Amino acid sequence: LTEEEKQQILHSEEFLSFFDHSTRIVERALSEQINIKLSLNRQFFDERWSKHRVVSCLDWSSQYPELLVASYNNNEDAPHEPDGVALVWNMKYKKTTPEYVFHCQSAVMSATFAKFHPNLVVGGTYSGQIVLWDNRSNKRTPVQRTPLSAAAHTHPVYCVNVVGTQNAHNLISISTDGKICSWSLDMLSHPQDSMELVHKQSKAVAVTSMSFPVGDVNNFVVGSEEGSVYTACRHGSKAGISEMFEGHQGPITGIHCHAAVGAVDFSHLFVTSSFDWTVKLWSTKNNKPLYSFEDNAGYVYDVMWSPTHPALFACVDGMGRLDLWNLNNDTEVPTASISVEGNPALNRVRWTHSGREIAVGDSEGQIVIYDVGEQIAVPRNDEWARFGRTLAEINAN
Amino acid sequence: LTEEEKQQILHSEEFLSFFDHSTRIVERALSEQINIFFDYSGRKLSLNRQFFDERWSKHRVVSCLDWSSQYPELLVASYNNNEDAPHEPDGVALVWNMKYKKTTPEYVFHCQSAVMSATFAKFHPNLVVGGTYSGQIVLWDNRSNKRTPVQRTPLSAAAHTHPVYCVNVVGTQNAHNLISISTDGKICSWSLDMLSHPQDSMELVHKQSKAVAVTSMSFPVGDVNNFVVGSEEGSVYTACRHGSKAGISEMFEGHQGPITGIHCHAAVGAVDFSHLFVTSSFDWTVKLWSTKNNKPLYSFEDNAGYVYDVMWSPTHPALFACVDGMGRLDLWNLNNDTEVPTASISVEGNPALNRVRWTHSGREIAVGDSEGQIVIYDVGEQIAVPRNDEWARFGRTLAEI
Amino acid sequence: RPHIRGAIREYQTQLIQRVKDDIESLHDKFKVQYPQSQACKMSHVRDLPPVSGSIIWAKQIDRQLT
Amino acid sequence: EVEETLKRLQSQKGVQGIIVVNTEGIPIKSTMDNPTTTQYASLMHSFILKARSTVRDIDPQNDLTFLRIRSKKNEIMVAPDKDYFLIVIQNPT
Amino acid sequence: EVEETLKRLQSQKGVQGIIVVNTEGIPIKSTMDNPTTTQYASLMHSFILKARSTVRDIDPQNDLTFLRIRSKKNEIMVAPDKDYFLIVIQNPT
What we know:
- Chain C: It is found in: Cytoplasm, Cytoskeleton.
- This is part of a larger assembly, with two copies of chain A, one copy of chain C and two copies of chain D.
- Chain C is mainly α.
- Chain C contains three helices and no strands.
- Chain C is rod-shaped and about 55 Å long.
- Chain D has a single domain, classed as Beta-Lactamase, CATH 3.30.450.30.
């Protein structure tokens, strides 16, 4: 009846799930009923959170699709607004507003989900701090944080990903510096293992972009600040930097290993994407830039390989042009290439974990969902392996 | 009476045009087919009594407890004399009534000597008996105009030299054999009426004249003349009341510490042969044994305070009740629990639990505190579980290795 | 072997700290003297006075620590 | 041909029961028994009568057109027709 | 953020007012003409009581989750929870 009693009960510890299910079910009633080749499916944007807020990463939800982390950077235009913003959006729901919002304190970078955790969302920050986000929680607040230990990541984190089965799964963030840190998926105040990627010259290698070959090897490709793509075992006698793959003219902006068996045998390959303006194909056992790709005008930032087709991938540019690429057909041109309105110099490309659709992490603001349906895995196992053999032979000059 | 004919209106061509409008609504409504998203939605004790008397339970020390088969829900809270009443006669035995829920003693059975384990007397509820520290055994009779023992045992060679730690009944009124176990390596199977000269005074000594000191070794239920032997240093056995096995004939050793309570299996609900005798001792574990192990089949858990007693539940055949010297009651079953307790809590404050005896009526543990108050606890929910052969499976697999 | 060590840290931290806490419990157990422990009183009830019962207590802590 | 749509609605995803109200709270067409069809549909007939009274109390020109209820164990759409009404019972999944 | 919820869900077109009523029937959330809509809030309070009686009397185990109503002129929903409730009115837009 009185304002005191209302602001009691509103700010009491009862209306939390009430407001949550209120917003959730009213947004659930937003889908209108009626009573009478690149998709360009749907743009995902919000001015309350994204305007001069470039994307930082993107990753689909392994478990429960139609959920992808829209991690961003926060411009200091409104410094009062939380630095670092990570959101999720939806496809099966079909609305305009994002699914969630998460205030942060530092520019969120490389935020993803947590495997074997249907509600835990980790995220690297520009402060070097690593946060966590929870669906069973009831805020925008990081549920946990990490200290700034002498061995922890003081430098900004650029690639945080869960590693391991559910009986033993770790989480590894990596600063720019080169230290990698193992984490516990329940507590967060203490580094489990915090070693450092060291090289004989320039010990603290300025890393970026980790990725893992599916099969959870303790080896992970690491994109250096200038080519020098080192990949390294996590321990053994090769705790730090172990092998050197180089011959790239610039800053590595994106990396990704091979996806699962589309048709062909696993094909232990990975790729780069750099400021050299060309994507280069690389295998795990060569110390050779195996096969370079097209010299698209401007930079090439991210790259992701389709989990379905064992030979098709995508990338972005400074022009806002998804220049996807299969390789069973082409050898020097993109297979399908579409653009975006204007020329937003894009920053993320994401094949969906579910396969046969793709999220383009648009740079300034929005997130545009794309899709394809004519690119599948016909049993071109050795036909693709043949193509790999054609590369392995034609590059020999 | 709703209608003369339901079918004609519905069988028609124009009332079904309104039904065609309704099925047009149905076709309009069933076309959506969208379901709701989850977003991480997600979707035994009883405190029976307390025995505080102003003259016979003034913070005493319980020697041992005993649940009488005849006239159930009665226990002789054998309270050894504490320093709170030195002038009062030592080893105060008092019968109780769980059926009456009292805190005042029903009868007083006090004695001139420090009585240890004043148990009942089968078919003689009021003719309570008790072994003493002096080496003699005393038989009281509340209804004999003497609360002091009416049948005292002389301390000659016929009786025991060392203290009598466990007097216990064997057989009904026909063969009222009262075995009085002492710490001399000599026991005496007395009678429940005369308590002057021992009827069967066999000796649980080794081949040498050593003092095989027992530590209140209990008896198997049934009284098949086979009694488990637990001395002050392991010596886990099964001696017979007669024959050549009336001593240290058999041997199931490899145990460390005084077996405070060596209890066999309780009432069989759905278990095996029911002969597995566990050993509550000072080794901070209740090691399990059998008539064929000759090894600690399965050691239980304890980490603070000595296990001073063990007794198994007659209701649920696989679970028991063990103690410590702090208050924990790790009650659990072998068929469903490895070593974790199904129910366990430290008693009020921190009393060194000397005894735990399951009530003969069913699943009520007479949790004997360090104080002269038997705060009994009923497990309730832990009732007899059928197909309890997993108890035998657990025991066999642990008997193997 | 170093591979197993790089993966052994997982168990190793918690397991070593668990045994550490057990040894800490043993420490706190022997910090208090024997007569102030209830084991002394009930041993005294079982004709194990504070001298010949203290050996059982000390060897008991020895058994658990070993 | 209501019977062919009935036959299509037999093995449709989630169909708990297929009935209809026939005589303004007194149903006759029943693939179920007496309570679940007739008594529950007469209850719901009085309940949508109370709801039409509600919306008529908001505005007497404003009657009701269609109803649907979702719950834990069922999702039931209700189509109020002119004299008789309609009840369709369906699973949520 | 409750006013942010008000703005974000009133920006959804068709909606004439987010007038959410509690279990008490008190206008804990009203954005429109309050003597007009408090009568209607008390009505739909009584008829949420009708719907919860409907669910818990027709079925023992069922829980009322959500309600769909098509009126003549607009499209109005009801969102009940276990402790408190919701009302909002929307047009076909």
